[PDB]
Design a protein around this motif. Sequence first.
Motif, PDB file in Angstrom:
ATOM      1  N   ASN E 114     -11.888   6.867   6.921  1.00  0.00           N
ATOM      2  CA  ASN E 114     -12.710   6.526   5.727  1.00  0.00           C
ATOM      3  C   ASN E 114     -11.153   5.231   5.223  1.00  0.00           C
ATOM      4  O   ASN E 114     -11.026   5.065   3.895  1.00  0.00           O
ATOM      5  N   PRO E 115     -11.276   4.200   5.674  1.00  0.00           N
ATOM      6  CA  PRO E 115     -10.772   3.132   4.643  1.00  0.00           C
ATOM      7  C   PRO E 115     -11.260   2.621   4.023  1.00  0.00           C
ATOM      8  O   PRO E 115     -12.563   2.268   4.227  1.00  0.00           O
ATOM      9  N   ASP E 116     -10.010   2.075   3.115  1.00  0.00           N
ATOM     10  CA  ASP E 116     -11.018   1.602   1.670  1.00  0.00           C
ATOM     11  C   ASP E 116      -9.811   0.351   1.422  1.00  0.00           C
ATOM     12  O   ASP E 116      -8.886   0.611   0.096  1.00  0.00           O
ATOM     13  N   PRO E 117      -9.879  -0.423   2.203  1.00  0.00           N
ATOM     14  CA  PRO E 117      -8.737  -1.736   1.472  1.00  0.00           C
ATOM     15  C   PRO E 117      -8.865  -1.828   0.188  1.00  0.00           C
ATOM     16  O   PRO E 117      -9.971  -2.465  -0.325  1.00  0.00           O
ATOM     17  N   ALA E 118      -7.691  -1.952  -0.675  1.00  0.00           N
ATOM     18  CA  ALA E 118      -7.149  -2.803  -1.879  1.00  0.00           C
ATOM     19  C   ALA E 118      -5.797  -3.109  -1.729  1.00  0.00           C
ATOM     20  O   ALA E 118      -5.122  -2.561  -1.700  1.00  0.00           O
ATOM     21  N   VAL E 119      -6.048  -3.788  -2.870  1.00  0.00           N
ATOM     22  CA  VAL E 119      -4.496  -3.991  -3.757  1.00  0.00           C
ATOM     23  C   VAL E 119      -3.989  -4.147  -4.875  1.00  0.00           C
ATOM     24  O   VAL E 119      -5.374  -4.474  -5.640  1.00  0.00           O
ATOM     25  N   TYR E 120      -3.887  -3.428  -5.193  1.00  0.00           N
ATOM     26  CA  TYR E 120      -3.157  -2.956  -6.686  1.00  0.00           C
ATOM     27  C   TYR E 120      -1.927  -3.312  -7.527  1.00  0.00           C
ATOM     28  O   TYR E 120      -0.737  -3.737  -6.813  1.00  0.00           O
TER      29      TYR E 120
END
Lengths: 276, 9, 237, 99, 193
Positions: E114-120
């Motif tokens: 389950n990929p979830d591309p995110a930049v925090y």
Amino acid sequence: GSHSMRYFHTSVSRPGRGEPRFISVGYVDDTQFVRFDSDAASPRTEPRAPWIEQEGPEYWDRETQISKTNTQTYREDLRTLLRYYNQSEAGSHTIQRMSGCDVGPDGRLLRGYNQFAYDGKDYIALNEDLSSWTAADTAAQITQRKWEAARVAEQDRAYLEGTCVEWLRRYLENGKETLQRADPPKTHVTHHPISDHEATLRCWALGFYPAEITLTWQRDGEDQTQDTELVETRPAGDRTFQKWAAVVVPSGEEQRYTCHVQHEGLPKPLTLRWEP
Amino acid sequence: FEDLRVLSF
Amino acid sequence: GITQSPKYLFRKEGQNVTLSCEQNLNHDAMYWYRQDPGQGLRLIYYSQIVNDFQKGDIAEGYSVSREKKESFPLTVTSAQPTAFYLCASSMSAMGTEAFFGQGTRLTVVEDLKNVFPPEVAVFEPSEAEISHTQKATLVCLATGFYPDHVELSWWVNGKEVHSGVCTDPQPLKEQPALNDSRYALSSRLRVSATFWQDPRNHFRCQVQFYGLSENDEWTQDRAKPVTQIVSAEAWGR
Amino acid sequence: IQRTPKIQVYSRHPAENGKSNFLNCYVSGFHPSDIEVDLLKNGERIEKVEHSDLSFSKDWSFYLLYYTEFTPTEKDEYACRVNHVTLSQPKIVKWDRDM
Amino acid sequence: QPVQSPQAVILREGEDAVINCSSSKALYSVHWYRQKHGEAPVFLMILLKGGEQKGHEKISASFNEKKQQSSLYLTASQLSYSGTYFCGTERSGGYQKVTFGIGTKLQVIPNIQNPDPAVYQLRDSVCLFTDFDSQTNVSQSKDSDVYITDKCVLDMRSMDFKSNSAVAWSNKSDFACANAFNNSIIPEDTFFP
């Protein structure tokens, strides 16, 4: 018919004198071809047969390293056998190894060898199956077990079935005119009276290659071997060998029986009878 | 042709 | 087993250093290797028995001795640059298995003034990360250190962590043009939302730097960049 | 274990007075290897004396060949002076053409 | 001297990898070691003969007829199989030495369920690009003051959850969280809070 290659090893500890001696000598049947004595001025694997010098510089170079290492290996073994055999340092001891293989006329491996001896008596020998070990005692069993765990017998089998067969086949080929040439014995009988009522019939055999020879003195009938005296087959110093067999004949109507000589260099087994 | 000693005692 | 010393070592220009390798398994054969990217493992020196050792293929610049069955030390002289040295030892070689030592990282430092310890800082997981996924990621950054003689370790509640721990296989050059450029390394620890949000959970991140010794002569305005442990700390929220 | 050598004095070819030959001494069956073999001409040692490389038989017992060039004459006498751990005094074996 | 056929390989999780090695000179034995870059190579298995031995699944090896060519087989490849596989060759008299060549750099990539591309953006000042698929290649940092790390796989053994990540930081005031990753092939549906 058959052919053998052997590598004799001797490691002698000389405490109070200095470092031990390592002498490794190789033989193709009954002929020496290599020599490495660690006690030489400049220790090196040296030629001993004319039919071995044809080997390239690499042959000598690789054998010299194997022997310069084996020297240090046998040093450690002389130390290890003091611990094993519950022996002190002061004493002078001897380690012997006999490597090599016997091949039949068909050039196929007949028997493989990897034997060891400590102080004259047996130590550890590789069984004919080239898998198992025969320990002479419980101290040798320590080596048997060290070697079984490290799968030593497998490494030997690889050399004895492979390397040793292939090299023996190469050596015989280079020394074709010598190693595979039939040299029969020069037969004659000598008569000497040991007393007045008794005499000696000595059967001589000279200049023969290989060493294997049977000399049987028979008094009409075959079985007369229990009262015949024979020497060890001795070397002449020019590749060929010697041997005599003397039986003590009485005096009278007795110097009428014969001697029989068997050598593979003979077309038929020869039969000798003395008369003056 | 001799090979190296396989293993020590 | 086999003990290869030291784990981390620096060398000055035209200096000679002796690397250690000791065993008790009573193994006859001992080996020294040099690992370099693309070249792989390469045999410097080897010994199958006491007093006897053989060269090939990486030398000069190297010298060994086999005075005992237990030890086979490698002396690296004034010739050679920077590499990872490994050490093996087998019972009877050929045949038997070869067991290795931890390894030795050798870097040639031209001047001691270039040696710097790491500046360690810990970054608290973002709320946008917990609101998007019930998972919280902590970041530990080691900045401005020289040479690459470090080992990152995450510690949660006094115990050393390994699950959800992620350190960069290679550090970043702070000044890519320079060779004697300082390094940067990031390690990250991920746990569930519940573990990070609890205050009784403690987040420590150790960085063990290997620097100068007691014997070294320091002169500069900075404090002596000796072998030290510098760590950042974080708490539950 | 100690074993006593089996000394044998003989020639390379049959003894012909005035004609060149080799005087051999073949020590066999001994243990240890530490042997001292001297070749004598009328009870006197010879400087020019070579020997074969140390080797043994299946029974581990050692063997060596000590040899020198010589001219046999009916007046000259040839013998061998051998010493080993097993011997209390050096044993001498006389060369005999007949047997 | 010992030649290794793949020399470097990248594969999916569970995928079956086959490492091959050969020699020119007949060897007595072949060793297989796996190493984790700055560690000690861990011993896999030794082969003396002469045929296939032993068929112990996950990590099994083969040694051809006679001889020189030995191959290592890896079936249900796990994340722990990553590293440099080395072939150790040993020869008869008097070439007794364990010889290695250029080992094969095996890389197992996680199959992101389950990929979830995110930049925090993490507290104190740092950028974290995470939960992006293994096909996503985080590469370059064209800016001098901007530092971008390579992809590094984290494994939450606690939950059986694995995930890719790259941390970015810069001294510059113009270093934006949305603008942080540009040279790297970033997906369209990438999350920016």
